[PDB]
Design an enzyme around this catalytic site. Structure first.
Site, PDB file in Angstrom:
ATOM      1  N   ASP A 168       7.482  16.417   3.125  1.00 41.59           N
ATOM      2  CA  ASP A 168       7.609  15.346   2.094  1.00 41.59           C
ATOM      3  C   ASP A 168       7.035  14.049   2.680  1.00 41.59           C
ATOM      4  O   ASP A 168       6.637  14.060   3.855  1.00 41.59           O
ATOM      5  CB  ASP A 168       9.052  15.202   1.581  1.00 41.59           C
ATOM      6  N   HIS A 176       2.195  19.335   1.214  1.00 40.16           N
ATOM      7  CA  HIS A 176       3.308  18.643   0.506  1.00 40.16           C
ATOM      8  C   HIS A 176       4.311  19.670  -0.027  1.00 40.16           C
ATOM      9  O   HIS A 176       5.369  19.236  -0.497  1.00 40.16           O
ATOM     10  CB  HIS A 176       2.771  17.694  -0.584  1.00 40.16           C
TER      11      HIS A 176
END
Ligand code: NA
Ligand code: NA
Ligand code: NA
EC number: 2.3.1.61
Lengths: 233, 233, 233, 58
Positions: free
Chosen positions: D33, D29
């Site tokens: 995204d 992450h």
């Protein structure tokens, strides 16, 4: 564009190609088509196939029916069983039928001689003997020379319909095709039959429309009911 | 082998055969096909056949519909109603249509002159008069010379489909075939119709793909609904 | 008969007509036929048509499927992707495909180059770009010269079936035709499918029956299930 | 990739059994995204449910 690999033509494919060209350019080649229901002949092979092989020691194929039908058609239409020799028209009073056989190295058409005098079993044996020689490549020039008419079977490769090429000095050629299940009108009901398209390429110099069409109709009639060879109708 | 009866060809069949060959070799002959539903024309003959003969003293055949459809197609595609005279392209502003009639001695093709100016009854009378002369063999040299386009009917002999031969100095020829009951898709339902295959052989030197295909589509459209001749659509 | 309007041919159409003749008379042109179910390709266009145009900015036609299928068939049958140079057979190790486009001024056949290296979207863009240039008449001599194989689509004009003409020095040409709803046998049940006839005209000097038939069967197999192009089977 | 299990599925408002497999994408992450991770895995689902989309590229 990228690169080009030139490969010269061998003595054979050079003269095979020269002869297909001189054939096409020397004849008025036309093609008439028809269709035939094979269920009748397929049913005969399903029913008597075992009994036929036991009695004769050779399996009953389609080719014996096609030859038997072509010979009867050649009798009814003697103009189709003829050549043009320059200024003369040669009518043949015998039935020698060229028959295209597959060899991995090219394709040859050996001749079945006096087929009018052979039984169904004898025909299938002479075709196997010529087909073994073809696959092995032990075929005589006696075996290849002559022939009044050619039968070719492009149906072994799944062709629906095609224009076969005349094999001069012959006048015509019959092209067999794939047997394909097709919906057909039968006594006002839509019924599926195993149908094959027939092609007759013919020299329009010697054979007119009536004879070419009528010749191919005769073959259709005798394949859809082989019993008509016996009655002669 | 057995025996052969060779009989030499006269000045006639020698030079007729040389001229069919030089025709085939000197033109770029191709053939485009289509199919047509005859039920509409068969229904018109069943319905108005009695009333038509009473009024005009001649039976209503198929050939009047075929001629009427060919003339309208020759008007829409003037490239098909033309010849090639060496270095010139000769467009004809008249409609003379060669028409094959069945004769015991081969097949003969008399010419129908100024067919653009004839009614259905007049057409059928001129065809019967030329057909009697053919069967009797009383056909004039005036009757045989000329013609801009040929209609041939190998359907009289039961041909499914064929490649007809151009009659130079003409550019194209339309081949009629047997009418055969065949399953057809109609509003997503399988219905049996009396179907005929149409063949147009055309000279690709003068007639390109679009014109040849479009000409034969026009004839299919006008045979499937003869009422389109009146509306002109 | 009445009057006739004679129009000379320039060297424009004089040498095109002389070259169609030398093409026809220098080759042994034959034509093999087959049929193909278009429902699979018609379903892909109905399902992904919107999403395809959004992503690539070009509409998904049939021609991208036909080209993709022809290139794969040219790989499997390299004898069809060849020319005859006198005593040599020239094998091409690249895929330049001539593609007939309809223009108001005759018909032109521009070439798609290295099509083996193009995606579906790239193919459809190059066809629209060559089709705009044809309609406008801004097509280069680079764009017209060369090509190993021709695809023609007379189906845009509603032809059922035809004999396409070889575009020398090429060996073969594939003819696409009208899509017509026809009853078909599917697991012994009559189901209506949108069927198109395929025609391959081929030079029998260089291409024998097995290759011509097998080439056209390959195209049928890849159009009836376009997912076979990915799996290569 | 996971086991293929016959499972009841809603298809054009009819309950039909299909051979279903669950897909998992684990992603960093820091670099990837939500929109890219989800959209990547949706793309794989779309191309496995119709492999003919690889040819069309859609
Ligand atoms: Na029948
Ligand atoms: Na129809
Ligand atoms: Na099929």
């Amino acid at each position: 564009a990228r690169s080009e690999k030139r490969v010269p033509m061998t003595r054979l494919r050079k003269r095979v190609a020269e002869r297909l060209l001189e054939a096409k350019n020397s004849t008025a080649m036309l093609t008439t088509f028809n269709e035939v229901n094979m269920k009748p002949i397929m049913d005969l092979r399903k029913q008597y196939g075992e009994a036929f092989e036991k009695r004769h020691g050779i399996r009953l194929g389609f080719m014996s029916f096609y030859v038997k039908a072509v010979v009867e058609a050649l009798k009814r239409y003697p103009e189709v069983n003829a050549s043009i020799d320059g200024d003369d028209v040669v009518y043949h009073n015998y039935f020698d039928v060229s028959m295209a056989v597959s060899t991995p190295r090219g394709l040859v058409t050996p001749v079945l001689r006096d087929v009018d005098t052979l039984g169904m079993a004898d025909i299938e044996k002479k075709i196997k003997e010529l087909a073994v020689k073809g696959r092995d490549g032990k075929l005589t020039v006696e075996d290849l020379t002559g022939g009044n008419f050619t039968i070719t079977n492009g149906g072994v490769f799944g062709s629906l319909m095609s224009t076969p090429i005349i094999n001069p000095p012959q006048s015509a050629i019959l092209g067999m095709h794939a047997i394909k299940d097709r919906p057909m009108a039968v006594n006002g009901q839509v019924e599926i039959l195993p149908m094959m398209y027939l092609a007759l390429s013919y020299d329009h110099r010697l054979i007119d429309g009536r004879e070419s069409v009528g010749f191919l109709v005769t073959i259709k009639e005798l394949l859809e009911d082989p019993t008509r060879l016996l009655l002669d109708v």
